């Protein structure tokens, strides 16, 4: 029996054999008040006090939020899937702990990912029962608010204030400094890792002066706030949470009366209509997500990023070979993960348009003129390569390169990855290469489980990503020490070194996409 | 009379005429409950406070241990030898004071080596009046548990966790810490020191989190925990905690099991069973060493030291001309202390199967190929030569300037000697040459005493190494500043410079044992 | 009426017209309990606290002392004469404010010369009302005890430890410490200056743990502790306590006993034995000085000087054009204040003898050898002016360049001046040029006094020092900022640039006595 006392009361947890060794995991533990009734729209309640012994022994409801329903009994996408009954009532966070016990343990927060309008913390490769095994870390996740319910904002008023979702993430991060020194772990040795959208999310708590004392470290998979998806302007969060009321029959002319009237929606509802609160998206929409609110976010984060207003600390940022493929089985014509997708010029030329809705002709002419430029026009599928480029580029390889450069010109140490190896088990076809999301299962030491049916060559390599991971967190410097491993030299502007990630042989490479986030970076902004 | 108020009671301690001077020591303070019955095999626990008066007027029990019977009646072996009865009521500790009583004065702690296996803080060659008395600081010295009463380890269960007799030492240096300023000691002015596992000892007190903040400076003479021999994996401890029992008759399958009945053995015969628990050991054989318990230990060291994981201060390092001569003599074919000992090579080939005993055949052929290439082959004592190289240099040397570097590579001052002076009184023979373990009694200051048969010039040159190392501790720089005295440079990753200690002249030299090192250091520890 | 609160009473004051102006002056406040009786050798007591108004209005007694009888009515020698009682009851100091009552004025506090055997802070010389009125500073100044009144060591024993005169300054320190606020001084920032002994006192409390916190600067005029007259070795010390003893019939055999039979003789007793405690002194003489006490001092401070032990901050150290002179017509054959003093070589050998008493026979012949190579020896005035240069650059400015050197190659800034302007009204001979002692005047500001016949030149160069020297007090920079004055720059291990005080021009030189000094720092030590 495993029972733990914290802040607000005791709670069970459960024993797992894992490699031959055992890992206590506490599932399901609630850090806030349940955000239903009243409190939908709002800013988490803290969490009032139980006594007897709460059970944490399953994953708890995940937050409401719509379904990938685009490849029904495909794994490749409903792996993303929630996996526990969605609810409101999704306020709760899981920790895994080794056994026995540790002393003071570092602490490995996980926000998942999910363009902040879905995931969810229980997915299988958010598992971190083996990081605690292996590295004897504390593994800490939690469940936040996604969507309208997460992220609606009537800018200035607490009823509908924005970032709720973010202020969960931040809930949770408090009840770690406050209860995790009772389950053996260091809060004053925190490190927050996330993926895409949780990615995003780590970047942001760098920024927000309420998160600065909640954590030590971040690393930032696939994703960081000055990603094209990343912040909803004022101007268009309005719009949205207008047009959310208009298609609930709850336009009022009192904001405060609009989201009394959304509070008597029901889930599904609200749900139902969130993809047409803009005239177009797509694939890679985000309509209700993180907005400047003068609370979490107190100016525009390019602004802060620039300016040098963030969390002074290492950080440790990465991105995979081929970001944009997942994309382009989403809306963009000529592909499918049913073929091999060689697409036409004019078929890239209308997926422009998928991905570059408005979108000045003259801005995807130059897309197409930068992206374009063949050697040689021979190869059919230049263009089916192109097009995931540009979307990966554009939207996580570039902004993740310049949060790094920026980040680091304020004199904090920073290393970047390159993750160049695609899964022996990847569902997805070939063409789609090394794909966005398909670092997580390496990063989540899903490979150092033999049963498992990886690669000999994908197990080494998951072990030494952990081990790096882990030495990040424990000592801000993602080395592997042992096993004359390549050395991970810091990211500076000027040299902008980065560590290639595969099963081969792993580099030091200057400058990834040096010419095509030229062009992201400096021109494109300007279209 | 001489009574000084302890947090835990009153102490006596007596007066001892130096030099024409007076010193008081304080011999047998106890500083833990005595670690017996159901307390052997954990963690010292703190003392209890008596009233009355405890007598501190001589030496205390040594600690249980084996002890050298390879050459009775031999001086140079059995001054090692305990000269207290042993006990497991065991820990207590030792101070001398100058006489007056000193207002705010340095702290020089000592702690002993012997392999973790043996030792004690009573010997002659570690008997700080001559410090006291000469230099003014106060010398603390500590009795700690060795072999398994003190190593023992079953990973993560406090019934017998590991590293207990490092648990000893650093509850003693709280005692310092607490208590050292009743005796006129400056507890914000503490050097450690210690030779051979002593020294590696200190080490990892720079690495402990937990001791911190119980002292200012480090000496480390003979030894570092990177040696080979200091730290016992976790596989071998558990191995040969298993070995252990099963050879008491204690195999359990509760592990809790095999320590109750570990418990009920009686001294003698776990001491009696030590040297079993492997398969093969060496004259260097550590059974039963500090592990990774997770507790004082919280890594593997060799990456703490790597990635800058502790304490940051000045260290002095040392080495002695002739490490490894010393161990030739337990077993390697064809030494011995009565004869020359020029053996054959095929001689120095058995040798090396001694100390290398598992050893990969290309393992031993390397060693070979590195040390044979003689300069030339004319030389009789030639292979003599070089299986004492080999051992010093594998054993104690590279790992000592391996820990310099790393050390010296986060920014601190580091300083490194080489002694090379033989004692003009030293019972083993001429080819053993500069000794493992004799410098001591220069550091202690025992050629100071005239009465007692040493040079003239080993009185200076040791009055010239008390002086530095007082001066190291006093103001972390080991300069002898009146004398005209070589200057002690800062040893730097580049430069690598160290010092010369010998009667002659002493000297600034680089890159000590560079070529023997490399080899050492960067290809043996890949066989 | 002016009545200021302080811990222990209240204190009046008296005003004063200066400069047609007001200084209010706290003349004679007692800092300690009177050192009589049972409190003869010891350490200073704290005082006791008086209900009603102590009257601050007159000088107070001058500690017991042997006074300059060589010649009477002569008042180059008899300025620095006591002019207040003798008593043993002198613990008393002196305030000078600024009128009106400043707010947060800084404080300077002056320590008087005198070869720790003689002075008093109530000369005329040393009055700061001039500074007070000038430049708004807070004056501070106070008796403490010379001879062996105040520095008899018997080493260790609190009957008679060493170093009393060093305390009685610190506890002065420690009275503006917690008193000064209520005169409208600031605490926080003191900077203590004094002349030769003064100044070598002011750099001992530079190294003096119990002093550290009681001062920000110091500013140091002829004088350094490295001075070969500065401190008495214990060796020495314990002669001299045993000679006075046995001079005074008090020689016992309990060391205690010495020293309460010592205290029933009578302070002329002691005065009137304190110049025959060695077999031959010189007019420079330091019978009982400072001791490395293990106290107030804790170890040789050249040990400390050169390993860096001592308080970070900035120092402004100065010294005179002809040191050497005054001391020549205390014991030298053929000088005279009355005559030329031409003397022969044979003349100048005799005086080395004076002062280089033991004083190797090759020692003096190489003082000789380096001093008499005349360029050319066709001058007669050449051994007059080789004898001064010799006992001055010896006895201060050597040291005070070393002093300089090694205490700024720890980092701090640190000024140097060369004093080279002779008073217009020196009632010593021309010939002895700008003699130890006659900066003071114009530190103090007495030529900023037009009744007093002094020139023009010499009231400007004043108000410029004072100007210097207080805002050095206030700022940590010796700089006159308004007048176009030459910028005074930092002093320098490698350049060592100083600059020269006089009428006409200021100057930034370099190197000092470059080629002098190499002889007194390098060689002579070692004879
Ligand atoms: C800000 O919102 C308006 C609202 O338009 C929308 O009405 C919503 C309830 C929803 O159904 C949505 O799909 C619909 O378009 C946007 O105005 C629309 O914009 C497009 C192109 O400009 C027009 O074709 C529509 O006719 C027009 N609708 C109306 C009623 O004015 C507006 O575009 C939007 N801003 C953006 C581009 O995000
Ligand atoms: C690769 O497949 C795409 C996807 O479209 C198809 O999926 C196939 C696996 C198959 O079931 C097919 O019937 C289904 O429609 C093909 O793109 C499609 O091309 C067809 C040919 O006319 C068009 O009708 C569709 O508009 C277009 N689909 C969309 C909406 O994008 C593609 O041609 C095929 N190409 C290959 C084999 O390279
Ligand atoms: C881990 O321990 C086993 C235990 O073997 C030992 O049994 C002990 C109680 C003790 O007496 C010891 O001397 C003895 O060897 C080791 O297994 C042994 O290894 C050697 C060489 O591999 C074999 O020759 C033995 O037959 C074998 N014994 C058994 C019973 O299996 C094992 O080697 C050890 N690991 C090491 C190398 O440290
Ligand atoms: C130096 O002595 C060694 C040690 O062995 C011997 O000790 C001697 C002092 C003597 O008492 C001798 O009888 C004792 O055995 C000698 O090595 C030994 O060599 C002998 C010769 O056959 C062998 O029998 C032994 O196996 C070997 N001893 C071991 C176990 O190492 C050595 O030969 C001698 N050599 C010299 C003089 O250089
Ligand atoms: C340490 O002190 C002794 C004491 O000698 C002195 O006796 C004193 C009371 C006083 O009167 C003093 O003038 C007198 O000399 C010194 O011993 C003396 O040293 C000189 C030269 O060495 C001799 O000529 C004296 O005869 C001798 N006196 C005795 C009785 O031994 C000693 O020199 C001194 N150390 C120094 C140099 O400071
Ligand atoms: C400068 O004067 C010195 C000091 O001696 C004398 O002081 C004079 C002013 C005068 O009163 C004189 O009588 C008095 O003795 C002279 O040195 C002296 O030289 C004389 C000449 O024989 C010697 O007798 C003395 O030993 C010596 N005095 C001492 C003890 O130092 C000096 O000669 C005179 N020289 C000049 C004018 O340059
Ligand atoms: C646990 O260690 C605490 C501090 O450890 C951390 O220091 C931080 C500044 C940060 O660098 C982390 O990465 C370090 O690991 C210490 O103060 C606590 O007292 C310790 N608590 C225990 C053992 O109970
Ligand atoms: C004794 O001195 C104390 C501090 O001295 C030490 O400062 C440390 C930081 C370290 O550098 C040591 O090497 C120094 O010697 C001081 O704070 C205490 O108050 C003093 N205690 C006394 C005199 O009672
Ligand atoms: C008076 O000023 C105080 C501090 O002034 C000094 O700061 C010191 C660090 C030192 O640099 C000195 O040279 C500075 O002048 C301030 O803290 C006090 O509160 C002030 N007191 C008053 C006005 O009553
Ligand atoms: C918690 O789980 C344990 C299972 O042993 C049990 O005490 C109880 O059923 C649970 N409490 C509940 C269901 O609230
Ligand atoms: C709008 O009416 C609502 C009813 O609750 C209230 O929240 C708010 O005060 C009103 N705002 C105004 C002043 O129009
Ligand atoms: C280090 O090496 C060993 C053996 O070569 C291997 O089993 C392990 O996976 C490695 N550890 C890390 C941290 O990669
Ligand atoms: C401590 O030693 C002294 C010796 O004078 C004495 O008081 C007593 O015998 C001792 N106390 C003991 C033996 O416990
Ligand atoms: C093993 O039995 C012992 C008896 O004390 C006990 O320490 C421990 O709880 C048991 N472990 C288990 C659960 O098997
Ligand atoms: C310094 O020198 C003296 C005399 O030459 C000598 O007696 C002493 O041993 C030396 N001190 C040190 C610290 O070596
Ligand atoms: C202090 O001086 C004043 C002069 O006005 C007066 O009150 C009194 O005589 C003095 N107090 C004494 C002499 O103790
Ligand atoms: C010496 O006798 C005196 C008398 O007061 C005393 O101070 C001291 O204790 C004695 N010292 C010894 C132990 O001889
Ligand atoms: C500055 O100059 C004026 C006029 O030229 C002069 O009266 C005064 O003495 C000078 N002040 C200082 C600080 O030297
Ligand atoms: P991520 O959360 O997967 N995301 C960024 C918006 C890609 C849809
Ligand atoms: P040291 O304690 O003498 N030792 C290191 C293991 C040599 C036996
Ligand atoms: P100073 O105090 O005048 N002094 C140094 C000893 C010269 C006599
Ligand atoms: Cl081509
Ligand atoms: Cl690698
Ligand atoms: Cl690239
Ligand atoms: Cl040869
Ligand atoms: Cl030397
Ligand atoms: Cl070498
Ligand atoms: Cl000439
Ligand atoms: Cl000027
Ligand atoms: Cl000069
Ligand atoms: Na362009
Ligand atoms: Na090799
Ligand atoms: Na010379």
Redesign the interface.
């Given at each position: 029996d495993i029972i733990i006392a914290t802040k607000n009361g005791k709670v069970r947890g459960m024993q797992l054999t894992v490699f031959g060794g055992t890992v206590t995991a506490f599932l399901g533990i609630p850090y806030a008040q349940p955000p239903l009734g009243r409190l939908r729209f709002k800013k988490p309640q803290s969490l009032t006090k139980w006594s007897d012994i709460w059970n944490a022994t399953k994953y708890a409801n995940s937050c409401c939020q719509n379904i990938d329903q685009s490849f029904p009994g495909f794994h490749g996408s409903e792996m993303w899937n929630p996996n526990t009954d969605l609810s409101e009532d999704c306020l709760y966070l899981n920790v895994w702990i080794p056994?026995?016990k540790?002393?003071?343990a570092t602490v490995l927060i996980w926000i998942y990912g999910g363009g902040f309008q879905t995931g969810t913390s229980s997915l299988h490769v958010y598992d971190g029962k083996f990081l605690a095994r292996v590295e004897?870390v504390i593994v800490v996740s939690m469940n936040y608010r996604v969507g309208a319910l997460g992220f609606l904002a009537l800018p200035g008023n607490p009823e509908a204030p924005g970032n709720m979702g973010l202020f969960d993430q931040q809930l949770a991060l408090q009840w770690v400094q406050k209860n995790i020194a009772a389950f053996g772990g260091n809060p004053k040795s925190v490190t927050l890792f996330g993926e895409s959208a949780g990615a995003a999310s780590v970047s942001l708590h760098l920024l927000s002066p309420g998160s600065h004392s909640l954590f030590t470290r971040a690393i930032l998979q696939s994703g960081s706030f000055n990603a094209p998806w990343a912040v909803t302007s004022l101007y268009e969060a309005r719009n949205r949470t207008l047009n959310l009321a208009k298609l609930t029959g709850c336009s009022r002319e009192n904001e405060t009366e609009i989201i009394k009237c959304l509070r008597n929606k029901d889930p599904q509802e609200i749900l139902l209509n969130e993809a047409f609160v803009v005239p177009y998206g797509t694939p890679l929409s985000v309509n209700f997500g993180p907005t400047v609110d003068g609370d979490f976010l107190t100016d525009m984060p390019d602004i802060l990023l620039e300016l040098g207003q963030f969390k002074k600390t290492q950080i440790l940022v990465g991105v995979n070979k081929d970001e944009g493929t997942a994309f382009l089985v989403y809306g963009a014509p000529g592909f499918s993960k049913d073929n091999n997708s060689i697409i036409t010029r004019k078929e890239f030329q209308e997926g422009l348009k998928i991905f570059f809705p408005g979108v000045s002709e003259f801005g995807k002419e130059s897309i197409l003129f930068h992206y374009t430029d063949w050697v040689d026009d021979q190869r059919p599928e230049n263009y089916r390569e192109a097009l995931g480029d540009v979307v990966g580029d554009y939207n996580f390889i570039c902004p993740a390169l310049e949060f790094t450069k920026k980040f680091s010109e304020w004199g904090n140490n920073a290393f970047f990855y390159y993750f160049e190896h695609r899964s022996s088990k990847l569902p997805w076809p070939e063409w789609m290469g090394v794909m966005h999301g398909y670092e997580i299962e390496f990063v989540f030491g899903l490979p150092l489980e033999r049963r498992d049916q990886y690669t000999k060559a994908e197990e080494i390599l998951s072990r030494s990503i952990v081990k790096r991971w882990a030495?990040f967190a424990?000592?801000g410097?993602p080395?592997e020490?042992?096993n004359?491993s390549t050395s991970w030299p810091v990211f500076k502007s000027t040299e902008q070194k980065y560590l290639t990630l595969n099963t081969e042989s792993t580099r030091i490479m200057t400058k990834l996409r040096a010419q095509q986030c030229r062009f992201w970076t400096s021109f494109f902004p300007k279209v």
């Amino acid at each position: 029996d495993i029972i733990i006392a914290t802040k607000n009361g005791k709670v069970r947890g459960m024993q797992l054999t894992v490699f031959g060794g055992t890992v206590t995991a506490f599932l399901g533990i609630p850090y806030a008040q349940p955000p239903l009734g009243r409190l939908r729209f709002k800013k988490p309640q803290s969490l009032t006090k139980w006594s007897d012994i709460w059970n944490a022994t399953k994953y708890a409801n995940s937050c409401c939020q719509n379904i990938d329903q685009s490849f029904p009994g495909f794994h490749g996408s409903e792996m993303w899937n929630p996996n526990t009954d969605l609810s409101e009532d999704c306020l709760y966070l899981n920790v895994w702990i080794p056994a026995p016990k540790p002393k003071n343990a570092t602490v490995l927060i996980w926000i998942y990912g999910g363009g902040f309008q879905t995931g969810t913390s229980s997915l299988h490769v958010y598992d971190g029962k083996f990081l605690a095994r292996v590295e004897r870390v504390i593994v800490v996740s939690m469940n936040y608010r996604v969507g309208a319910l997460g992220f609606l904002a009537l800018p200035g008023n607490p009823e509908a204030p924005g970032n709720m979702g973010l202020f969960d993430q931040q809930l949770a991060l408090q009840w770690v400094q406050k209860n995790i020194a009772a389950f053996g772990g260091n809060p004053k040795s925190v490190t927050l890792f996330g993926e895409s959208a949780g990615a995003a999310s780590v970047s942001l708590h760098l920024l927000s002066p309420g998160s600065h004392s909640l954590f030590t470290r971040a690393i930032l998979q696939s994703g960081s706030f000055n990603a094209p998806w990343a912040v909803t302007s004022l101007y268009e969060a309005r719009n949205r949470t207008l047009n959310l009321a208009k298609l609930t029959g709850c336009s009022r002319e009192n904001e405060t009366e609009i989201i009394k009237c959304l509070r008597n929606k029901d889930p599904q509802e609200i749900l139902l209509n969130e993809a047409f609160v803009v005239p177009y998206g797509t694939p890679l929409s985000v309509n209700f997500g993180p907005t400047v609110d003068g609370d979490f976010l107190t100016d525009m984060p390019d602004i802060l990023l620039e300016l040098g207003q963030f969390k002074k600390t290492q950080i440790l940022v990465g991105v995979n070979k081929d970001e944009g493929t997942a994309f382009l089985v989403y809306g963009a014509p000529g592909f499918s993960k049913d073929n091999n997708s060689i697409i036409t010029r004019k078929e890239f030329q209308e997926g422009l348009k998928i991905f570059f809705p408005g979108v000045s002709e003259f801005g995807k002419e130059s897309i197409l003129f930068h992206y374009t430029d063949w050697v040689d026009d021979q190869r059919p599928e230049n263009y089916r390569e192109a097009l995931g480029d540009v979307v990966g580029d554009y939207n996580f390889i570039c902004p993740a390169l310049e949060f790094t450069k920026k980040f680091s010109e304020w004199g904090n140490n920073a290393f970047f990855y390159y993750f160049e190896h695609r899964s022996s088990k990847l569902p997805w076809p070939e063409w789609m290469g090394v794909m966005h999301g398909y670092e997580i299962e390496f990063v989540f030491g899903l490979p150092l489980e033999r049963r498992d049916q990886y690669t000999k060559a994908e197990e080494i390599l998951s072990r030494s990503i952990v081990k790096r991971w882990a030495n990040f967190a424990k000592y801000g410097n993602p080395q592997e020490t042992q096993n004359n491993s390549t050395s991970w030299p810091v990211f500076k502007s000027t040299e902008q070194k980065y560590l290639t990630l595969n099963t081969e042989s792993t580099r030091i490479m200057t400058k990834l996409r040096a010419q095509q986030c030229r062009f992201w970076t400096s021109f494109f902004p300007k279209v």
